[PDB]
Every structure is written in C-alpha cells, then in structure tokens.
C-alpha cells in the first residue's frame, strides 16, 4: 500500500529560455510577441486612409492640375504617399518649410477647400494668362496650380499695387499658400510685371512676410530656368490676412479649412495596397491583429499597437519543466 507525490507531464515540445539554461521544454507557456502582419492598409476607427496615388503631398495640396482626382474636401485617418508619385511641384521651385508642412498636415483629419481670394480681388491686372507648359493638366498642355493664381500685367499699363483681405470669421484655422516668381532674366521680368522694384508683402496679427524677386538663370527643370518660391501659413480663427503686392505675386486663390486631429496622425510612404477592411492597429508595413503585448514588425504605426521590440521571441513559462517518462 503506497502513496506517491508527483507532478504533471504532457506531450509539449514548446521550449523557453532561462538565465541558467537554454531550450527547456515546459508543460505550459505563453508567447508574448507578435511577428505576423497583413501586408495592406485598412481603415482606422472605420475612417478610411487617403491614398495620394500618383500625387506627392506638395502636388496634392498646391493643387497640381494632374491631381484633380484629389481636389477639394478630404477626410482621412492617415495619409499614404506612394514612392513613385510623379505629380508634385511641376513649376520648379522650393516649398518653404516643407518638413514642417508635412508635420502639420499629418496632425490633421479633414480639409475643406474654399475660395479665399476670388480672381476679381486683384484690381487692374490679368488673372487668366497665368499658365505654363511645365504644369500640364490632363487636357491642356499649359495650366497651373488650382489653388494658386499666377498674376501678370495687362495690356500695357504698369502692374499696379494690388491688395487683398480676408478676416477668418470661422472656428477653424485656414491652411493657405502663395508664391514669389523669380524670372531667369530682366526682359522676362519686364514682359510680365513691367519695370520698377517689385515686392510681395503679407501680414496678419501674428505674422509678417516680405520678399523681392531675385533675377537669375537657374539650371533648367521641366523646361524652366525661372523659379518660384512657394510659401504656406496658417490663419488662426479671428485673425485676418492682408496681401499687398506690386509684382511677382503668385496669389492665394483657394485654401483649406483645417480640422486638427486629437489622435496621432501619420504619413506613410509605402506602395502597399489599400483594401476594404478594418483595423485597430496599423503599422507602415501592415496590419496587426493581436492580443499580444509585444511586436517586432514596426516602430511606426497609427492606432493602438503592441510595444515594438527587436526580439524574435518572448516566450514566458507558465507550466513546469516537462519531464515525461
């Protein structure tokens, strides 16, 4: 007659590591790390992402004519920019504070396009010949940014002082754009804006801007030796904007009422497919569907994701050392 004391064994081959010993088979364990992704983009909070397709961020938001598919109001949970987008800044030039612009837009949720300065704002000048072959649309060989208007002298008269004003009476900040033209030589300058020292001056309650044309021949890009210095800013609720110029102004035409997100916001550069599905966790390299605590897929995500870690495995023993006989 006998009684023995003992412990559980089973058919487990699953192993864990300890400080004293590697590769120890245990009866029960839990894996804490996820290494599996769905290689696609999905909706977050069942709001869809904004695919740029063949437009870059600059082309979309400046209103590049070949980005008409995107033109107007947009809502997004995040933005996907494709690595081989061809339609960006068509008329050569620098967009000032580009990296801060992308960060600002990334913090957003929704834009409403609206007409900020109708072409009939600018007295005594031409608003209908501001096109170029550097900026084709899909139908015209010479067009321009739908959110800007390239102002040129009329008939013969010297290009006069023009003025514009907009008091933001709404509750939402306004994202807007403008520019300063820099011709390649002094005859192109006179053909377009006449003679005299020209300026572009802008101002709000909290911001001043002043720039002059810098005439010089730059290397040809998209067939142009001239340049444009593009600019952006944000008009806060209650502020008002004054535009005063007597030459070289690429005027703000349309602009965006901007809704700031409370979540995180992201701008993913990726060629992954956007599909019709939902997710709570979206990394730049795919969706994660897990309960697990860690993941080694990506540090870059939107939504609620597991902690990122370089580990291949994080298996925790729960059961005991498996010693079957």
């Amino acid at each position: 007659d006998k009684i023995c004391i003992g412990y559980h064994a089973n058919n487990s081959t699953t192993q864990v590591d300890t400080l004293l010993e590697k590769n120890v088979t245990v009866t029960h364990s839990v894996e804490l790390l996820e290494n599996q992704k769905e290689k696609r983009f999905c909706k977050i909070m069942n709001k869809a992402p904004l695919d740029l397709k063949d437009c870059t961020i600059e082309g979309w938001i400046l209103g590049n004519p070949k980005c008409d598919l995107l033109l107007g109001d947009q809502s997004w949970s995040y933005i996907v920019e494709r690595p081989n987008a061809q339609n960006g800044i068509c008329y050569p030039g620098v967009l000032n504070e580009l990296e801060e612009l992308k960060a600002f837009i990334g913090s957003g949720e929704r834009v409403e396009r609206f007409e900020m300065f109708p072409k009939s704002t600018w007295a005594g000048v031409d608003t209908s010949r501001g096109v170029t072959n550097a900026c084709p649309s899909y139908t015209l060989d010479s067009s321009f940014y739908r959110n800007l208007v390239w102002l040129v002298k009329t008939d013969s008269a010297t290009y006069p002082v023009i003025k514009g004003t907009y008091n933001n009476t709404g509750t939402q900040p306004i994202l807007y754009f403008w520019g300063v033209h820099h011709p390649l030589d002094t005859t192109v300058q006179d053909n377009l804006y006449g003679s005299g020292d020209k300026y572009v001056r802008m101002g709000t309650e909290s911001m001043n801007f002043a720039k002059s044309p810098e005439i010089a021949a730059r290397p040809a890009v998209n067939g142009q030796r001239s340049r444009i210095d593009y600019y952006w800013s944000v008009l806060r609720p209650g502020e008002t904007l004054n535009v005063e110029s007597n030459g070289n102004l690429i005027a703000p035409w349309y602009a965006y009422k901007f809704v700031s997100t409370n979540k995180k916001g992201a701008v993913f550069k990726s060629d992954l497919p956007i599909e019709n599905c939902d997710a709570t966790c979206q990394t730049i390299t795919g969706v994660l569907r897990t309960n697990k605590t860690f993941q080694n897929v990506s540090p870059l995500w939107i939504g609620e994701c597991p902690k990122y870690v370089k580990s291949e495995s994080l298996r925790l023993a729960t059961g005991l050392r498996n010693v079957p006989q």
């Binding site: 009684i3 023995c4 400080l19 804490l32 990296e99 870690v309 370089k310 925790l316 005991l320 050392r321």
Partner: protein
C-alpha cells in the same frame, strides 16, 4: 531546480495525471489512480496568472516613433531623433528579454518548491506509519483504504489510529 524535487529526487513527471500540476498516485487493495492536489495547483495557477498579468500591465505603454522628415540642413536634429528612437528601442528590448529570462528561471523554481512542500506535507503527516522510499513514494506499514488515502490528500490523516 534549486529545491531538488522536479527532475531530482522525483525523477520524472506523470503523463497520467491530467487534471493539475501537482498531485498524487495511490495504490491499495481497491487499485490505482492519479489525483491532482487542487489546493496547491489552484494557488500556483493564481500566482502565475497574477505574474503574467502584472508583466503584461507594466509593459502596457508604447514609445511612439514618428517619421517626421528632416532637410539636408537638419542633419544634427535628424540624427538626434534617430539615436533617441533607437535609444528607447534598445532599453525596451533589453527590459523585455531580460525580464523573460529572469522570470522563467523563478517560475520553474516556484513549481519545484511547490512539489517539494507537497512532499513535505505528506511526510509530516505519515511519520512512523509509512516508509519514505526517497523518490516521493511512501509505503504504508498499515492498510490504507480509499478513505485513508483521501485523508492524506486532504491533510487530515489520523496518526493515532492504525
């Protein structure tokens, strides 16, 4: 294991005991059988469940990388952002991997301790009335029927009898 029971003086486990982590094998005139010790098994499950959840809860924050961009004249702050992101990636990897190795060692030790104490609980009950074979088994000197067995398992074995 540091307590000497699991893969120690009790050389192996029981595939035949399916209803718990620690328990008994008895043998008498009515026959043989395995039975889990539910008190010590449940206590171990509660403890390890609590350990798993506490780890899961302490790891419940995330460092958020961003891919803000940086121009060619922002090499210094672009590299500052990279070294900081890599910085937190390295300490959290260290924390997770080190915690798992440390907790695994102590978890196996806990089970080992529990088998040992269970063995001691029974040894302390039987005393003279059984022969300790040195492998976790006790040979009774008296007849132990099914209610005698059950009194050892529930810790109410009556020594003055028999």
């Amino acid at each position: 294991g540091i307590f000497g029971a699991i893969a120690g003086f009790i050389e192996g486990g029981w595939t035949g005991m399916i209803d718990g982590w620690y328990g008994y094998h008895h043998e008498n005139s009515q026959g043989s059988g395995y039975a889990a010790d539910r008190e010590s098994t449940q206590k171990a499950i509660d403890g390890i469940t609590n350990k798993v959840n506490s780890i899961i809860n302490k790891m419940n924050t995330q460092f958020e990388a961003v891919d803000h961009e940086f121009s060619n004249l922002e090499r210094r702050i672009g590299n500052l952002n990279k070294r900081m992101e890599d910085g937190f990636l390295d300490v959290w990897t260290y924390n997770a991997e080190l915690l798992v190795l440390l907790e695994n060692e102590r978890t196996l030790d806990l089970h080992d301790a529990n088998v040992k104490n269970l063995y001691e609980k029974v040894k302390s009950q039987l005393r003279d009335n059984a022969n300790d074979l040195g492998n976790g088994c006790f040979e009774f000197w008296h007849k132990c029927d099914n209610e005698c067995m059950e009194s050892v398992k529930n810790g109410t074995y009556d020594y003055p009898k028999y």
